Every structure is written in C-alpha cells, then in structure tokens.
C-alpha cells in the first residue's frame, strides 16, 4: 500500500487466539445486553464458567458464493443458532471448548470475514432471529426485505470490510439443554431441540458481480467466527449418560 | 449498521415542528392497546354432547397473537378485512410476559354461564372446538381452577382477567401449529379457557351466540423486536 | 546473545498461486514445519555439491542455538508477502504443541490450539510470535554433535492454512511468493555449551565412510618422490619424507576390507614429478617428462607399508593395475622391476596426500 | 526494516517466564568463550632441517577465526565434526582488537622448548608449516621478540598470552587466503608463533606430539555484526 | 489522487540538491554511529571538510530488472563501496564533489528509489557488508538468505516506497586512500584497493511479477543515491602525482 | 456413569438412618407436575432421576 | 499411620543419655558422603582403534547410584564385597539435583591425558565401554564441551567436578537398563565422561590402569525418600 509493510491492521485478542482485521466493521446487537439474574433460580447446582475456553474465537464454516448462484435473496447460510457440532459422521464433540452437559447459557458474538478484490461489487446481509424456527412464518421471513428489519450487519464487497453481530442470551427456559430429552408424547412433553436459540441468516443483498474476464475470480469465500462472552453450565452428567441425535436440518 | 443507522445524511430542511402525540388531537399515541377485538362465533343445540352437564361448550386456547384466521362467508369481518390490530402488533415481536383481559358476550341464553381458566393445559390448538366435536376429558369443568360463575339474567357480558402462569422466563407468541416442542405447548399460550352452561337444559331453538373480545394488560410486555413479516392489504380483497 | 538471535533470518520461500483450482481452496495446508530454534534442514536455503557437504543458510537464532545444548522461549516468525493492494486473503497460522508432523493435522483441528488469523488486505508484513508450550523448562536441540544415530524432536509444530482463498485479478500477478523469516523472542534463552551442530563452509571437503586410503601417517609428511638404496639400487621411484637414508613415507592403517589386487588414486592435492622404457611383449612405454601424480601401488616391507608413484595418465593406470596384480601373486622382485624410474627428486607436497581404491 | 523489526505482531500468549541465563542452571550464558580448542598435530625427526639449532619446528599463524580446516584420516576431530566454537562464532563478525591466549602441549620430549611471537610478521599462511619444508629465514629464533623458554622436565604444557600489536584501528578476521592487500598481511593476524627446541639433539624415534589449544582474551572484542555464512551440519558427515 | 494536485510529497534537502519522496521509507544502520577520534592520530596535517560538496545527494546508477531476468537471488547491483568513479574510458574524476587526495574518510547514506505501478509485485533487498571483498566466503554470502542477516533495507514493489541505508565509517586504517600505492611485493606491501570499505548488495527477494498483458511494462528501473554526512581529507598532493588504475571488478 | 453426577457415598457401618437431599437442577425455574387432571392423554416428565448402587 | 507412627508406647525406662553424634568420637554423623569409591579397571593396547587419535579410551556414563555391578575374579573388590556406600545410600531415594566430583588415576602412562564431559548425551549404558568396542561417533573428542587436559609427568590423578545440566526438575537415580523413555536417557544421568590420550603413540607393553573414584557434591541432594530395596549381606559371600 504505502509502507514497506502493508497498512497497519487492527487486532482482536481473546483467550489463546488472535483475529486480524484491516478495515472498519459493521455491527449491531440482537437485543438489550444484560446480566442474567434468574438463572440461579433454575439450578440448585453451582454454575461453572470457563473463560479460557468460552471466550475463544472459533472458525466453524466457510461458504463460497459465485456469480452464477448469486441472486437477490440467495441464502448462503441458514442454520439453527447456536449449533456448532461437527463430527466424522452426522453426529457435542469434546474436541474443542464444548461440553457434554445437560444445561447451559451464554451470550454470543458473530464475526463474518470476507476477502474480495478491489474490482468487485455486491452485498451480503448477516442477520439473526431469536427462535425463528418456532415461528409460524419462518420460511416467509427469509427474504432480505425482512432481514433488514431484524438485527443484522451488512457486508460490502466493493470494500473489504468485517462485521460483528452481538447476540445476548434470550430464551424461554432460561437454561437451554445441550442434549435431548426424548421421552415425551407429541401432545405433552414434545421433543426438545438442543441449543436452539435462533436462526443465523446470511444472504445476497446485491448479486455478486465480477469482471467479465476469464482469468478473473468468479467465486468468493465467506468465513464465519463465533465467540461466547460468559458461559454457565449447571447440568453435570456422564458424557454418554445422554446421547446426541442427528441434527434435524430445517431449510426452505 | 444498527437497525437505525444513517451513514451520510443530506437534510435540505429543518425538522418539522414538534407536536406531542396528543396536542392537535388529545390522546397520547404510543404502542399500547386495550382495544377489544372479536374471537369466535355462534353455537347450536346439535353441537353439544348427549350429556351436557359440567361439560364446556367452548375450548378457547389463549394466544396474545390471536387465533389462526379462518375465512367464512357467514363471517365477513374475517374475510374482507383481516384480523384486528393485536395480532399484527404482536407479529413484530417475539416474547410476552403478561396476562390477557377477556370480555365475553352470551346472547341467546338467559341461564347461568361459567368460565374457567387452565394455565398448565398445553396450548396445541389454533382454533376453538365446540361440543361433541371437542376432545374428551376436555370441556369438563375442573374443581380447583380459576373460574367465574355469572348469571345472564343480571348481565350477559363476562369480563375477566386471565393471569400469566408459565414456568419460564418468557411467553412465546406467533407459535407454529401442527408438529412439535416443550416450548410450543407450555410456554406459548396462557392455557385454555372453558365456557359452559350451568344447566343441562337444552339449548333454545334459535341457538346461542358467543362473542369473545379481548385486550392486553398492564403487566404485559412485548419484549424483543423482530422483523415484520410481509403483510396483506385489506384494500385488495375484491380482485 | 539477545542482540544476535533477535536478527531475522530467511527461510525457504514458496509460491502462492490464486489460479490453482485445486490447491487454492478453503482448508488447504500451504506451509508447515516443526517449531524449534534451529530450522528444519528442508526449510532452509540449501546448496548441495557432488561428493561434498551440503551447505545450509542458517538464521542467527539457529546458528547460535547449535552452540548450546538446550533452549527455550518464544520464537518470532515474520511472514513477508509479495503482493499489491489488489490481492486479498486470510490465513490461519496455528501453534500445535506436542506435534511434529502433519499426519493428523487439518484446519478444523488447528483452530483448537493457539492460533492467529491474518488478513491479506493491503498488508505485506506481519509476525506470529509462537509460544513456548513444553512439559519441561528447557528443550534439547533437534540437531547435535555426532554421538548417537538419532536427532532429537521439536516440542511443537507450526501450520499455515487457508481461510479465504487468495484472490487476484486479470491485470495482476496470480502468484504471490511468501517469504517466512525467523527471529528469537524477548524471552528466548540458551542453556548449555555443547559440541557445535554446525561447521564452517570455508572448506566443505570431508572424508566420509568411503574407503579413503589414509594419507600415510602423521609426521611422515610432506612427501616427495625419491630413491631408496634397498629398492632396486635406488633406480625406481618411491615416496620419501626425508632426504636422510631409511626415511621412506609409511602408510597408516589400511582397512582389511580392501582388495589385494587393487591400486589407488589421489583424491586431494597432488604433486608433479618427472619419470620408463618399453616393456617386452607390450607397447607400454613412458616418455621422459613431467606428470601429475594420480595413481599408486602399495609396497609392503614387513610391518611398514610404503607407496609407489604413478603418473595421472590412461597408460599409468594400467601399469599400476598390473603392478598391483603382480604383488598379489607374490611375483619375483626382479620380474616386477619393469615400475617407473627415478630421474631426480620432486617438489614437496603442501601437506598430506589422500588416496582411494 | 532494521535487522530486528516486527511490523505487525500477532502474539496469542503472554511471554514465557523470565529465567536469568543462570537460574535453572548455575552459569551466566552470554557470547564469551575462553574454552580451549586444538590447532595442530605431531612432528617427526625426518621433518627438521639438517642443522636444527635455533630453528623453530612450527610456524603458527595467529588467527582469531582459527586455521583453514584440513580433513585427514589420522585426525578425525576435524573430519567427522568441524572446527570448534571459536571459528564459527567469529564467522558472524568482521573485526577484533584483542590478544589471544595460547596453551601448548609437547609430549614426546623431556628437553627444553621455546615459543616466540612475531607481531609484525605478515600472516600470509592459512596452515602451519614444519621443519625442512618451512620457508627459509623463517623458523629462525629472533633476538628481541616476546618469548618464553620452558623446560619439559618441570611442566610440558606452555600457557602464554599473545598481545595485539597492529598499527591499525581494527584487526580483520575471516581473511581470504591466496592472492592479495596491505590489510590481509599486517592487519588480519596477530602475527606468527615460532615453536622450537633448545637443543640440536635428534628427535626421539617415537617422535614428538604438539597440541596447541587457544582461547579468547578480555581485551578482545567482536566489533561489527555481519550476516552468518551458510553452515554445515556435522550430523550428516556419514552419507 | 484526492486533490487538484497530487498527494503531498515529503522532501529531503541537502546542499544544492533536493530529493522528493511520496511514501514511507524502510531504513537501517550498518553499525553504531559515532564521532571519529583516532583519525587525528593518523595525520599531522589538518583535516578538511567540504559540507557544501560532501553533504550533497548524488545519483550514480540506475539498473533495470525485467521479469525474464528476475529470479530469487538475482544480483541487480554488486559493486565495491564506496566507489563512484565515472569517466569516458574505464578510469577520481574532478567533475563532481570528488577530490584527488591521498587519504579520506566519511560516513555514507544510501537511498534507493523505485517507481512501480499499482499492479505489480516483487521485492528487492538492498544490503551492505563491511569489507566483504576481503572475506574468504564473499561469493558465498550473496544469497538473499544471507543478505537478510546483514544490515539491509527492503523494497516492496507492491507499494511504491523509498529506503535509506545509513553506513557509518568502519575500516582498519582508519583513513582509506583514494588512489593506489602500487610499489609492493605480494608477500609484503600488497597492492591497496582504493576506497574499498565494503560491498553494496541489491538483489531479488521476490521475482518481479507483472500483468500478463502485452501493453503492460515488463521492466522496472532501480535508481540509487549516495551522500556523505561528514568528510575529512588529509592527503594533499598533485592531481597527477598519483594516478588512477582501472577498477578491478569483482563479480561471482 | 452415576459417579459423573451429583452423588453421595453412604456407609452402612453401625448406621441405620441417613438423608440424601437431592438438588433442583432444571433448565427452567418451575417444574410441571408429573400427574394431573384429566385433560390430555399424556403424563408430564420428571426433571431428574435418583439411583442407588 | 505415617512412616513413623507409634500407636501405644510401652516404654519401661527413660531415654539413653544424649550424645551429640560427635562427642565420644569427634565427628558429626549425618548422611552426607564425600568418601571416594572406585569405578573401573585397566586397559591394554589391543583394545584401542587402529587410529587412536582424538579417540577416547573410556566412555563413562555418569550415575549417582554408580554403575551396574559386574563380578570378576580379576577384581575381588566387587565380588567378595558389594559396591560402596554411595549406591546403597542412593537406593533409598528417588531423585537428585547435584553434580558429581570425579577423581581419576592413570598409572601406566607418562603422557598427557584428557577428560571431557557430555551433559546432553543420553545415558543409555550401565557399563563403561573401551576402545575398538566403543560405539562409533562416540569416544571422539568434541570441541565445545567442558574438559580438562592434564600431563601425567606433573600429576597422575585428575580431580574434576561434573556439573548438573539437565533440562528438568529432578535427576532420576536407580534407572533401569535395557528397554525404554525420555526420562531414562536425558533425565537420569549427568551424561558421559570421555577419557583419552593426547597422543596417538602406542600403549606401553605393560598397559595402562585407570581407576576412577567419585564423590557427591554440595549442591547435591537426595530429595524423596523411598522404601529400601532388599539388600545382600557381604558376610555370606563364601557359602
């Protein structure tokens, strides 16, 4: 750029991990951030916090969107949040700061990284919807016109820019279960979806447009990061006292 | 880019003179509504069970977002113009924690009527069910539930306030209908309201008409703002 | 020591192509190596030579560390990118403790350890100061003085992965060479002085386990071609080390794995000497002139072994070939006589002359 | 971009706990070495001149960076493992201004030995030369030069300190060998050291063995830091 | 750029000459900078200083490196420093601040200018080695891996950037001779190389890479400047009392 | 597997009585009764399980 | 029940009058020993390599608990009476952190002898190895290792102190012998000691005898008390 080195790049450091950024972010908060006080009223057992593990920024997925598949409304990622369970077969894995415990709660922060060229144009919109999977109009609210009204961050492809979406804990429990309690009828005690606080929406606000050249890149990768401000666990059990069912995908 | 974000404003003029929402008019306009809107229709004799004693006539699920709209030709208030303000207001939010006020009008009877509230009953219905066609072990009056017994000879409109009794942090509104969880049956609705007639005496030939109006309460709150779902214009209900 | 090992040294660079539709994908391993003060021989700029020693361009931290037995502290790996503003990417460089290879190493596993995510958006330089995570306080050097047949292991492993594949354009180079550089952290220390695991490249000549024929004995050099009164009345040529009588250059311990019919060749610095008539039955004849010493045949006389010079010529190699065969069959001393002649003395060697079968 | 320059640091952890270089061990580790390393081999009778009186047996050029390594099979300490620490330490610097300490061991003799130092003698050799094969007018003991006469009956190891006597600002180390200037002969080496035997009496049949060890001094200094020349690993001396 | 004029460009002014720069430099110093005190102990004659002439920044050479010749280690300039003697035949010329005097000494500053486009990539490394011509491993230390360990500046071609290398006087004399004293034997009084304090190294750190277009420039010019902070001369003689021999080039 | 949760180890060595006060570990604040008035065909579930080994 | 525990004492008498360990005798008796005990035997010419220059004659592994006892008829001091005090004292402990003092006696030679110390060399041998039969790349004198060169004409007993250079918390004594870990090769022994002869000159016909005595140091400590392994009585070495 203008130095023997590149430009000076901003840094974000949490426990045992460092993230680098080069431009100005685009941020927003899901709801009023607070301090949980009724959670101690749900469990008699002492809560546990693991700052060194839970405060860490983790990379979970990277999706590629090309010009040919870039249309207004195109959903690049549509998954139930928070669910970051990755294993060899479709099967929470103990390989990272993840615990096989009955109950938990925490506030989340989502960072989206995109690295485009100086010569492309497009727009991505990353939004979040508290328990959208339980709404009778879920599949109807996936359109970017509806995403604009939900807490969301915007990504410009005509500028290289990062974005962070703060998502404070909001739920009806107020402790969400990490695993299943499957013994119930459909009329009473229906099956409980583990760790389903909401749905994270990223989509195409403006179709990814590239140069008409052959030697020009026609695909761009969208990487995501997730972190937890403060986590509490109150259900202590055997790692295999309860088991993990195959994640029920819910696409439109 | 928060939901309200203005990057570069090009404002050519000054702002409009401030009114208070109650000055050139005399009421304070904010988003709070205790305006009463309808919820059901009429019942006939042929609808009730063979033994209509301590058997409720209506099973009303309690939803802040109202019931699932069903258009009829007998009832144009649902068909030409969609449901009232309340369910369109609750459509932009996710959670609630208050109770509801119910005003109930029973016109074809001059005999006593009862109304009972079942908080812990799972709200798994999106439409009211009547008489014989009601699920058994339901529409049976219970003993130790909040209730109100009223004579139609004195007054034929019942006004009660249904409380918020959920074992959770919030109350979920805009709940899906058909296939579950543990958040859709005990954390969504305030429960069910049973409306029955004290006597087992047959229903008059003309039948009875029950109109249930409801409103929000004070301890009620729309907690988290969500995006608005796409709406339908009532003005285009003829083409 | 802190001043020296703080200086950045260059490591083996590598190309970073954006047009490669196979290697330029999310998750691919671009670069990796064990974490230790010295650098992995394959990650260092090398200059090899036939029959010589391999030369490694070691960084300041590595050379010094090779002078000490144990070591500890953080290490500073500076990555320099040959890009311009148009290029864009993101890399996830990690520090995996307790690992020394990429047999079970992936991006989705590297995120579970001390790592950093660098962005390549108008940025050409950055440093990833890796920690010192060890079961012990000090860590032994990976490479050391010849004493055992095993190189010690590094405590950790550094790996660079792809997060968002490099993207360039049509009017810009699709290749962005990456130059990794190493320096020692402010907390870097070196424990105990030991046998250097390095040597100077001033002289890369070496004597491997290759059967070199021992350069006489020590004290019996320099050597020159002379005469000996007990060897054919001093008419033939032998290598002396002194003008005084009974001073013939003795050879060192010849290994017992050498063929008895074999002759030798000079493998180092040699000397020139003047020296035979035509032999009966053959066309073998050496014209009087000055030749460079190349071949030689061992003449044993009891417990002491001497060397007989032969010119570096296709003819001389065959004459020494036969002479080596005649001595193997215990031929009469008078019949082997027709061995180069002694004309005059020759110049002395700088130092010891080497030989080979 | 100075030799030590960190443009953008991404340090995930805190620094390692500071030790002093002498705490979990008991010595202070810095780059100073008075460790003694070898310099030459053995001599026989047939090497010395016909008139070995006041004629030195060895002509040792004085170089801080040691002598030019020469591999032999009689001497594996040069062949399997390269020269000692000192010449690899001096390889990263350009100039020196101190004197050298010499420890000399003579084992096959029980007769007196001398050692003389010639500061102004041009150091144009990279290898020691012995007896007859020494250049004439060299290995002749001089009169007014710094010297030390020692009897092997009392002690057979000579320890002396060679001073720095150069008419210049610095002393050049890592000097090339074969073809000049005025900086390579009078400004590189401390001079030459001559080792001889007081008597002209013949050398014992077994011969004599001279091992010269040396170390750095206190008034010695490695002044300017240069890049390190590519090294060779001793561990790969078998393939 | 962003003004009716270009961006504001930094300036460097010495005696009778001005240099312009536009970006941030990359600098380093050969050794500890100091004040000479033993030089007055070498000459009985009063020293002379010519600030107006010696402090001047001079342009001496400009080399072009193309993509086809740009390989890792490629030496763009390898000359003995300080030697800036330029004449019609191979023959110090009195046409500039240069003096035909017996002895001299000074500190030097080297500035390298390179002017690339916004669309090229590559790296140059300009280093210096005190009396490298006299080392037994000179030809062995020309590789960029070895240049990184010597005092050096880096040039990025992906950013237009300048660089300055401060080289304080270091030598064994401490007065270096401008001309020859040739009457000496190889054994004693060898011929003295005039003004040979070291070797200036510039090389290809990263191969010069251009666009694949035909109408795009495939060659880039590397210009150099040299200056003297403080110069002292103590040998006064006739301009032709001693003569200048042909500079013995020393390449590998 | 029971040792991996809130447990107690009682000894029966001249001891005839003891109490194990079990906690209230729940995802929510209040817990619905397992058995209730005839209204549906399903009994709700308890939040936990006690086991003696 | 700690290792020292007296539940119910039945002491009929008073205690014995206290002496200090040095009163009716004049030395203070506690468990510290700088008493020197033997470690090896003699060497002949036929044991050394064909090229015995800068090639050590002995490879001595450094163990506080001494070497693995091997009974011979040529050496009765190992056979009739077991190893000295030191290895029986170290048998009741687990860890050590100090250096060892070595006194070495070389009797059949009047030529110079060297002794070098290799701290980082893995101690994987329980017995000393001599000459030709020594593993290659071992018993080769190194350059930058702690050493001491001594002439036998002046004194034929070498006294040196081997330091503690281990990259760990402790030093393990009583190490097993044959089949590993990373604690048995770098954390057990202080390293290896190489003993060689400066000259390549042949060994005298009578051969040379090397007796290595050693003792503990001050910075040495027996840290953790373990149970005593069953012992053997020297008094029953004839039946």
Numbering used by the authors:
A (entry chain B), E (entry chain B): 1 to 91, 101 to 261
B (entry chain A), D (entry chain A), G (entry chain A): 6 to 185, 188 to 246
C (entry chain C): 55 to 329, 331 to 393, 395 to 413
F (entry chain C): 163 to 215
Lines from the paper:
Slow bee paralysis virus (SBPV) belongs to the Iflaviridae family of nonenveloped single-stranded RNA viruses. The overall structure of the virion resembles that of picornaviruses, with the three major capsid proteins VP1 to 3 organized into a pseudo-T3 icosahedral capsid. However, the SBPV capsid protein VP3 contains a C-terminal globular domain that has not been observed in other viruses from the order Picornavirales. Furthermore, the P domain contains the Ser-His-Asp triad within a surface patch of eight conserved residues that constitutes a putative catalytic or receptor-binding site.
The two structures are similar, with a Cα-atom root mean square deviation (RMSD) of 0.27 Å; however, they differ in the positions of protruding (P) domains of the VP3 subunits on the virion surface. In crystal form 1, five P domains related by one icosahedral 5-fold axis form a “crown” on the virion surface. The crowns have a diameter of 90 Å and protrude 50 Å above the capsid surface, giving the SBPV virion its characteristic shape. Residues from loop β2-β3 as well as the N- and C-terminal loops and β2 of the P domain interact with the BC, CD, and EF loops of VP1, forming an interface with a buried surface area of 850 Å2. P domains within the same crown do not interact with each other. In crystal form 1, the electron density map corresponding to the P domains is less well ordered than that of the rest of the SBPV virion, indicating an increased mobility of the crown. The P domains are positioned in different locations on the virion surface in the two crystal forms. It is important to note that the domains are not held in position by crystal contact in either of the crystal forms. The crystallization conditions that produced the two crystal forms of SBPV differed in terms of solution components and pH, which was 6.5 for crystal form 1 and 4.5 for crystal form 2. We speculate that the differences in localization of the P domains might be induced by the differences in the crystallization conditions.
